[PDB]
Design a protein around this nucleic acid. Sequence first.
RNA 1: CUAAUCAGAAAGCCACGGCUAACUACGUGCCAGCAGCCGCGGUAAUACGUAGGUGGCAAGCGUUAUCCGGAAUUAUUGGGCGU
RNA 2: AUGGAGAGUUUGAUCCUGGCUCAGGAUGAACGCUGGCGGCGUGCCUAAUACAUGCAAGUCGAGCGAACGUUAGCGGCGGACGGGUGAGUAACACGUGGAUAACCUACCUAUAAGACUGGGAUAACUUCGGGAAACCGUAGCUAAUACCGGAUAAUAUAGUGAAAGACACUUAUAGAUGGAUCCGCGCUGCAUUAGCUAGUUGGUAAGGUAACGGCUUACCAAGGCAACGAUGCAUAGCCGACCUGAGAGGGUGAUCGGCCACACUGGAACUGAGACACGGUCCAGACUCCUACGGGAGGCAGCAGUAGGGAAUCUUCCGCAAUGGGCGAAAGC
Lengths: 80, 136, 122, 83, 78
Amino acid sequence: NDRKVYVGKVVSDKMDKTITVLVETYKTHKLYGKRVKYSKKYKTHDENNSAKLGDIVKIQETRPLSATKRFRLVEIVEES
Amino acid sequence: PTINQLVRKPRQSKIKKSDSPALNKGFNSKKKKFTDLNSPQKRGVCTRVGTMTPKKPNSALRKYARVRLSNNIEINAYIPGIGHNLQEHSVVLVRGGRVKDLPGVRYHIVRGALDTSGVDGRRQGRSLYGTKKPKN
Amino acid sequence: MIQQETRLKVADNSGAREVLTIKVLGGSGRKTANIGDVIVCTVKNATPGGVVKKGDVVKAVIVRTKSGVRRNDGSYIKFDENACVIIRDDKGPRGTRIFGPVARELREGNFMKIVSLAPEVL
Amino acid sequence: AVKIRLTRLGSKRNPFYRIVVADARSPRDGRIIEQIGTYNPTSANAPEIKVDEALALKWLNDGAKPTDTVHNILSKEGIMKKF
Amino acid sequence: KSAIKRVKTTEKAEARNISQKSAMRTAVKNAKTAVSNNADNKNELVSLAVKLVDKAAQSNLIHSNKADRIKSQLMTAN
RNA sequence: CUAAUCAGAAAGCCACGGCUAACUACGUGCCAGCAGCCGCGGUAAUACGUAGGUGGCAAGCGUUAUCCGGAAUUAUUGGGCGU
RNA sequence: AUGGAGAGUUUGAUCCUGGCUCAGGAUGAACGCUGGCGGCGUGCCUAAUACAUGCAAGUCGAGCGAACGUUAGCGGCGGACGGGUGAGUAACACGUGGAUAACCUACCUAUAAGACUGGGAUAACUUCGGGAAACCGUAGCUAAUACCGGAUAAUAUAGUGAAAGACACUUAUAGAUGGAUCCGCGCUGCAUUAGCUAGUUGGUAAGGUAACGGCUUACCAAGGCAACGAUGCAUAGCCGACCUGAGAGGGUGAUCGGCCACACUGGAACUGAGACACGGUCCAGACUCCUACGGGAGGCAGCAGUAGGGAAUCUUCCGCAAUGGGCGAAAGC
């Protein structure tokens, strides 16, 4: 039983690695059936690196080792 | 009939209100606020007798009852039948709802019902305005 | 020394919290009154629940006042407030509970039913 | 701590029961995960003792011993005394 | 209604935990307080509490993994 | 619990026409009054007061009110555009 | 996919409609009627009311200080108890899988380190005592597989406790118990509530719970938000049950709860083989109250019954015998 390759994109950040990655998925509602796409926000972190202005990455579900943040993974696409 | 804005924006059902809103209720005094109950059975204790004259559709004469329910409000009744209970101050079994042709009244009497028995001029009814122990 | 227009703290469970003496019944010319006296007052502050409501004229016997009460042995005793118990015009309490201590002068005033619930009796 | 349990839906007309591994501090009725079957101690309904206790007899070296006067059913068997 | 013996074994339980936890309150008032202050408290004045906290923690209530955190910050604190 | 076993009754049914399924009338002369949506007496209530019962029934008569397919008066299967 | 024929509805009329009253029942469904009997079952659903009381997990030792294991309470138990529910929360309280790079432990079963050395205190017998009682004072006590030095006990890679009837003790260790340190989707409505809380973004603490870590604290910059529901916010259990659809399931989940919010009250120094404890332990409250007024502390969300509110809303008929929890090497509760 291993740990996924959760991915996403980035929006903004604050002092000394208040890092994050975006979360999203393909799925629908149970009632009126439309392919409307949807999202919710996450909490990863680095030293200062995985951050705003382009950090398309991966994330994890592990021991956070964090305040209320939860992730340790960054497996990327590219940078800007 | 387009489904995009249907989870954006929903629809309604019809619009209806149930029957006898000031009924199926037992008024508080300890906590002062009513109970939404829909009880099977209930009582009726009397304040007046009551009668209004102008009847077009029938165009005969017959009175009704003005019986107050709990603790200061107007509650009104009617006696559908050929039996006149020249009485008051009773303790009864309620009948819920209105019979045809009287507006606003929704409260009635079961045959017998602990107060009296009924108009004893009936013996064929065996099941109307007081009729117990009737040879079938 | 409880004269006319005086606020006292009722120490009962009837339903009152504060009353204002209207007249000190006892004779023609009476002005003040000490522990072991009956006075006529009115409820100025009550509590949601009880038998006594606000704006009612009832009788009561003042018990434990700020002023001292000299005895026969030459000893005194003064409290830190002025309280009183509401009676029922029969030398009996309208309530059933009593908060705080009471004086031993009610025993001579035929109040054995009021000195049987009070926790202490100094 | 482990004890025997049984199921309940609707019949009798002969003392019936069941085989399971429930908790100790509880009644005769208990939850069963690996349903092994039931038991008929009425000495009349022989076609009802289809209990395949495969995880109930594995408490021999895990934590189990005849208790609550239930050794009679284990008296016919002998898959114990391995230590 | 069997408090007729356990109205009061909570209280021998109390005494027999608290007096020994306090005899530790003097065992954290010597070594751990003075493994810094340069005092002699790193030899036999750390080692009394070996068998002393051992007089404590052979029973289920005294610290267990916190025992592994109180022995790793006094003996391994070199 | 056969047990010989006498005969140790299974209250009473509704509206009483036609739909919710019911049968006709003296009382009744609009005086009381019938009435589950429809619906009835002013001189033949195939309704009513009451009286022998046919449709359902015998441990059962009128009523009490909750969501179910029915309600296609949600439209997930089963939603109008000018009206 | 064991597939959908309802009573009558328009103006005056065929016609496109229009939904109502209404159906049958099913409801913890019963009330007057009627009250041949029952197989078995459920009924403070009136008021999670105030109280006629008690009521309830309980007793004991070829291992131990009274008597011809009786008579202890050390020790063990209990105490968080069975039962009562759906008063209280939009919450991992709830059904299922689950990283354990967030977890461990004696009760079920085998044991295993050994069983060495110890001092000696406390219950009872109370030993001695004031005084309505009983509440409290002197106070050696006499033991206990025990209140109990010390050897190494295992995680220095250098942590201690065992006092066995007879031909039963304390530890390196375990399978396990409720759980769960926690992950996930389980996890409803109010737009008469968007310019976003100062911790919004997350890194950085001496700390610590069998448990990572803004969890209080540790250091600094917010526009983190951003017109997407931040947030507020109103009932606040879920889940095998029941009427039920053709099927999607769709709702109520009450007899039936396997899991959790909850025992006069705010707490509570405490504690546990499992904590702030429904007949515990204290100290603030308002209650029917008991008391030479030591001041008592109790309330049947555990069977009854009392004044009741009562559509109905029950037997104080009996007492362990259908299972042993606990005490016990045991016969026994």
